[PDB]
Structures are given as C-alpha cells and as structure tokens.
Design an enzyme around this catalytic site. Structure first.
Site, PDB file in Angstrom:
ATOM      1  N   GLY A   2       3.947 -15.769 -16.330  1.00  0.00           N
ATOM      2  CA  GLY A   2       4.498 -16.455 -15.164  1.00  0.00           C
ATOM      3  C   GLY A   2       4.582 -15.631 -13.889  1.00  0.00           C
ATOM      4  O   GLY A   2       5.173 -16.082 -12.910  1.00  0.00           O
ATOM      5  N   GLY A  47     -11.991   0.092 -18.666  1.00  0.00           N
ATOM      6  CA  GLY A  47     -11.401   1.291 -18.075  1.00  0.00           C
ATOM      7  C   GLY A  47     -10.464   2.090 -18.949  1.00  0.00           C
ATOM      8  O   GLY A  47      -9.777   2.974 -18.450  1.00  0.00           O
ATOM      9  N   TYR A  52      -1.977  -0.117 -14.772  1.00  0.00           N
ATOM     10  CA  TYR A  52      -3.399   0.177 -14.977  1.00  0.00           C
ATOM     11  C   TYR A  52      -4.178   0.155 -13.678  1.00  0.00           C
ATOM     12  O   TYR A  52      -3.985  -0.728 -12.836  1.00  0.00           O
ATOM     13  CB  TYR A  52      -4.040  -0.789 -15.981  1.00  0.00           C
ATOM     14  CG  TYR A  52      -3.968  -0.340 -17.429  1.00  0.00           C
ATOM     15  CD1 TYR A  52      -2.740  -0.052 -18.032  1.00  0.00           C
ATOM     16  CD2 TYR A  52      -5.126  -0.212 -18.205  1.00  0.00           C
ATOM     17  CE1 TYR A  52      -2.657   0.350 -19.358  1.00  0.00           C
ATOM     18  CE2 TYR A  52      -5.052   0.185 -19.540  1.00  0.00           C
ATOM     19  CZ  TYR A  52      -3.817   0.474 -20.107  1.00  0.00           C
ATOM     20  OH  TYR A  52      -3.728   0.874 -21.423  1.00  0.00           O
ATOM     21  N   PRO A  86      -8.739  19.092  -8.767  1.00  0.00           N
ATOM     22  CA  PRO A  86      -9.428  17.986  -9.442  1.00  0.00           C
ATOM     23  C   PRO A  86      -9.273  16.626  -8.753  1.00  0.00           C
ATOM     24  O   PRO A  86     -10.248  15.876  -8.678  1.00  0.00           O
ATOM     25  CB  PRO A  86      -8.782  17.977 -10.825  1.00  0.00           C
ATOM     26  CG  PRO A  86      -8.484  19.415 -11.074  1.00  0.00           C
ATOM     27  CD  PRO A  86      -8.035  19.952  -9.742  1.00  0.00           C
ATOM     28  N   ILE A 119       0.847  -1.192   0.000  1.00  0.00           N
ATOM     29  CA  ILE A 119       0.000   0.000   0.000  1.00  0.00           C
ATOM     30  C   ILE A 119       0.887   1.248   0.000  1.00  0.00           C
ATOM     31  O   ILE A 119       1.842   1.346   0.782  1.00  0.00           O
ATOM     32  CB  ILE A 119      -0.988   0.025   1.202  1.00  0.00           C
ATOM     33  CG1 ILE A 119      -1.850  -1.249   1.237  1.00  0.00           C
ATOM     34  CG2 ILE A 119      -1.887   1.263   1.151  1.00  0.00           C
ATOM     35  CD1 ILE A 119      -2.425  -1.586   2.600  1.00  0.00           C
ATOM     36  N   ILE A 120       0.574   2.179  -0.901  1.00  0.00           N
ATOM     37  CA  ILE A 120       1.204   3.501  -0.931  1.00  0.00           C
ATOM     38  C   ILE A 120       0.120   4.536  -0.626  1.00  0.00           C
ATOM     39  O   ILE A 120      -0.947   4.529  -1.245  1.00  0.00           O
ATOM     40  CB  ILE A 120       1.891   3.814  -2.291  1.00  0.00           C
ATOM     41  CG1 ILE A 120       2.872   2.707  -2.707  1.00  0.00           C
ATOM     42  CG2 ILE A 120       2.641   5.137  -2.230  1.00  0.00           C
ATOM     43  CD1 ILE A 120       2.301   1.698  -3.684  1.00  0.00           C
ATOM     44  N   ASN A 121       0.404   5.411   0.336  1.00  0.00           N
ATOM     45  CA  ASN A 121      -0.534   6.452   0.759  1.00  0.00           C
ATOM     46  C   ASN A 121      -0.216   7.813   0.158  1.00  0.00           C
ATOM     47  O   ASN A 121       0.943   8.219   0.118  1.00  0.00           O
ATOM     48  CB  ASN A 121      -0.555   6.559   2.283  1.00  0.00           C
ATOM     49  CG  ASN A 121      -1.228   5.374   2.940  1.00  0.00           C
ATOM     50  OD1 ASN A 121      -2.451   5.332   3.056  1.00  0.00           O
ATOM     51  ND2 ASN A 121      -0.432   4.415   3.386  1.00  0.00           N
ATOM     52  N   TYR A 175      -9.262   4.886 -21.814  1.00  0.00           N
ATOM     53  CA  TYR A 175      -9.623   6.294 -22.018  1.00  0.00           C
ATOM     54  C   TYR A 175     -10.798   6.493 -22.973  1.00  0.00           C
ATOM     55  O   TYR A 175     -11.694   7.275 -22.664  1.00  0.00           O
ATOM     56  CB  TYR A 175      -8.436   7.126 -22.505  1.00  0.00           C
ATOM     57  CG  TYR A 175      -7.344   7.386 -21.490  1.00  0.00           C
ATOM     58  CD1 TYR A 175      -7.635   7.751 -20.163  1.00  0.00           C
ATOM     59  CD2 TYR A 175      -6.009   7.312 -21.874  1.00  0.00           C
ATOM     60  CE1 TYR A 175      -6.615   8.001 -19.251  1.00  0.00           C
ATOM     61  CE2 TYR A 175      -4.985   7.559 -20.977  1.00  0.00           C
ATOM     62  CZ  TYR A 175      -5.294   7.902 -19.673  1.00  0.00           C
ATOM     63  OH  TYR A 175      -4.271   8.149 -18.800  1.00  0.00           O
ATOM     64  N   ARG A 179       4.440   6.438 -15.131  1.00  0.00           N
ATOM     65  CA  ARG A 179       5.028   6.029 -16.412  1.00  0.00           C
ATOM     66  C   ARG A 179       5.985   7.058 -17.003  1.00  0.00           C
ATOM     67  O   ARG A 179       6.975   6.690 -17.639  1.00  0.00           O
ATOM     68  CB  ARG A 179       3.942   5.736 -17.442  1.00  0.00           C
ATOM     69  CG  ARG A 179       3.089   4.519 -17.156  1.00  0.00           C
ATOM     70  CD  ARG A 179       1.885   4.525 -18.075  1.00  0.00           C
ATOM     71  NE  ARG A 179       0.965   3.447 -17.726  1.00  0.00           N
ATOM     72  CZ  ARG A 179      -0.363   3.554 -17.711  1.00  0.00           C
ATOM     73  NH1 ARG A 179      -0.967   4.692 -18.042  1.00  0.00           N
ATOM     74  NH2 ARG A 179      -1.094   2.510 -17.365  1.00  0.00           N
ATOM     75  N   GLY A 223      -3.234  19.444   1.804  1.00  0.00           N
ATOM     76  CA  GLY A 223      -1.941  20.120   1.947  1.00  0.00           C
ATOM     77  C   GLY A 223      -0.825  19.541   1.086  1.00  0.00           C
ATOM     78  O   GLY A 223       0.347  19.617   1.449  1.00  0.00           O
ATOM     79  N   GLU A 242      -0.137   7.623 -15.186  1.00  0.00           N
ATOM     80  CA  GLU A 242       0.643   8.299 -16.229  1.00  0.00           C
ATOM     81  C   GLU A 242       1.853   9.030 -15.669  1.00  0.00           C
ATOM     82  O   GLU A 242       2.910   9.037 -16.294  1.00  0.00           O
ATOM     83  CB  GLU A 242      -0.202   9.241 -17.087  1.00  0.00           C
ATOM     84  CG  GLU A 242      -1.377   8.587 -17.794  1.00  0.00           C
ATOM     85  CD  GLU A 242      -1.022   7.651 -18.945  1.00  0.00           C
ATOM     86  OE1 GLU A 242       0.162   7.305 -19.153  1.00  0.00           O
ATOM     87  OE2 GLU A 242      -1.973   7.240 -19.645  1.00  0.00           O
ATOM     88  N   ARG A 296      -5.278  24.458 -11.557  1.00  0.00           N
ATOM     89  CA  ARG A 296      -5.801  23.353 -12.354  1.00  0.00           C
ATOM     90  C   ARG A 296      -5.860  23.717 -13.833  1.00  0.00           C
ATOM     91  O   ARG A 296      -6.159  24.864 -14.189  1.00  0.00           O
ATOM     92  CB  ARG A 296      -7.170  22.893 -11.842  1.00  0.00           C
ATOM     93  CG  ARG A 296      -8.300  23.912 -11.949  1.00  0.00           C
ATOM     94  CD  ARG A 296      -9.629  23.311 -11.524  1.00  0.00           C
ATOM     95  NE  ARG A 296      -9.750  23.215 -10.070  1.00  0.00           N
ATOM     96  CZ  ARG A 296     -10.616  22.439  -9.422  1.00  0.00           C
ATOM     97  NH1 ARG A 296     -11.458  21.651 -10.083  1.00  0.00           N
ATOM     98  NH2 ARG A 296     -10.625  22.439  -8.098  1.00  0.00           N
TER      99      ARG A 296
END
Length: 263
Positions: free
Chosen positions: A46, A117, A76, A139, A4-6, A119, A176, A11, A173, A193
């Site tokens: 594999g 899912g 993804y 956003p 898990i990454i939070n 685009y 990536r 802030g 993205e 934004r």
C-alpha cells in the site's frame, strides 16, 4: 518529486559522511515504526508511488556526478543516472518494473540490465567477492567515475559491478547498520582503503534474518539464535535484540508489530 541527498568524496571527512548517512536514514524512514529502539522501513504493501524512492546524488573530486535511486522499502540501489543515460537492475517482479518507470523520467536513454543487482550476481560479474573489494573514500571516488563513464564505453563490466558493490556497501549498508557506518568512518578518517572484514560481510548477509528475528521476537528474545562473525572470523551468537541496538540502524518490514502487551 523524490527527495535528493547530496554527498561528495571531494574532501570528505568523518563529519560530512556522518551527516550524509544520517540524512539518508531520515529520508528512508518516517518515524511511524520503531521497535526495540530500532526503526523499520516503510511497508511495501500500500505504499504510494510518490513515496517509494529517494535519490542520492554523488559527486567526486574529478567533478563528476551520478544519481543513485534507492527503494525506501529496503534501501536497495535500484539503478542510477549519469547525464543522458539511466540504468536499472533487472526487476524482481512486475510491480517493481512499473515502479522504476517513475524514476529519471526526463532522461534521454533508459536501460534495464538483464542482470539483478544482488551481491551474488554483482560478485560473479566483478570476478571478485566482497571480501576482496576495497572500500573507503578512494574506492568511492573511483566508483563514481566508473559509473559516470559506462555509457560511453570507458568502463568494463567487471569494473562497473565492482563499483556498484562499493556504492551499495558505503551507502545502503552504512544506512542499515551503524556498525558498517562506523567501519566506513574509520576508513575515511585515516584515508585508508580496505576490504570489509567478516563482521561487515556477515552483518550484510544477515540483515533480512536479523530484521525478521527482531520483529518476530518474544519481547526481544529470539526463538532461534543468529550466528554472526567477529573481525577475526570467529562466531558471535545473537540471542536478543538488546545486543543489536548499537549495531543495526534500520530494518526491512517483515511482520506487523504484536500488541503492546504491557504487564
């Protein structure tokens, strides 16, 4: 089980976002596969199920949380959990359908969307193209809330689709492409934004082809050039991996690396 990454939009700063994207990349790639200084994601073939996914726990200023599940083979977003419900995009194949049963196994309500899912599908559902959907901390803050409230009827389908589009670009993205990470860092720095320009869009669209071209290259040289776009929409021709080293952070596995073949 799955790492898990939070991240929180509450802030959020350039540094906290940078830390987040670095951590995502670190959990996506093992380090086993680096070609022309560019890391490659694990081969699907594999790959044990216990190593297949990572989890991104997104929180916001509104004190809401959602968990995105990312497939390590391609970064993804395959689905999400909000409280008592989980939702998965329509799987491309039977193997992927089996794979997602290993995600959010203790959740009370499991759903699979009839739609994929990608685009193309998400843009048609949103009623807006990526070029007209604003990105940034604001956003993303709002996207987290929209994902959270979907199961209780608070979020219309176009808003949900738009919110997925926001999450995918700001997480997958950015992971990536250092270039796209940089574009998001700028938006966060100034708390401004804006929709992605043609340079962002064309990179997103070309990720698969760039990955293949680099991996199939003759010592870094492309057999066929790839056309990207500048910020103003003008053409930028890519002939070689060299120009992409500061741009692309990870590649999807496309072929086996050719033997070292040093002189």
């Amino acid at each position: 089980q799955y790492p898990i990454i939070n991240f929180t939009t509450a802030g959020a700063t350039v540094q906290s976002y940078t830390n987040f994207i670095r951590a995502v990349r670190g959990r996506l790639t093992t380090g086993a596969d680096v070609r022309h200084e560019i890391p490659v994601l694990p081969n699907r073939v594999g790959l044990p199920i216990n190593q297949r996914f990572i989890l991104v726990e997104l929180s916001n200023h509104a004190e809401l949380s959602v968990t995105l599940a990312l497939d390590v083979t391609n970064a993804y977003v395959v689905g999400y959990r909000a409280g008592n419900s989980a939702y998965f995009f329509h799987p491309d194949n039977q193997e992927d359908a089996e794979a997602i049963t290993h995600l959010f196994t203790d959740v009370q309500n499991r759903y699979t969307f009839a739609f994929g899912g990608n685009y193309d599908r998400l843009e048609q559902l949103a009623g807006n193209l990526r070029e007209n959907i604003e990105l940034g901390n604001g956003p993303l803050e709002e996207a987290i809330s929209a994902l959270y409230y979907y199961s209780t009827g608070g979020t219309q389908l176009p808003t949900l689709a738009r919110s997925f589009i926001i999450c995918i670009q700001m997480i997958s993205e950015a992971a990536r492409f250092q270039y796209i990470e940089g574009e998001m860092r700028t938006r966060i720095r100034y708390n401004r934004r804006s929709a992605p320009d043609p340079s962002v869009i064309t990179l997103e669209n070309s990720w698969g082809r760039l990955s293949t071209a680099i991996q199939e290259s003759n010592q870094g040289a492309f057999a066929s050039p790839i056309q990207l776009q500048r910020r103003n929409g003008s053409k930028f021709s890519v002939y070689d991996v060299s120009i992409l080293i500061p741009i692309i952070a990870l590649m999807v596995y496309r072929c086996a690396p050719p033997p070292s073949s040093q002189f």
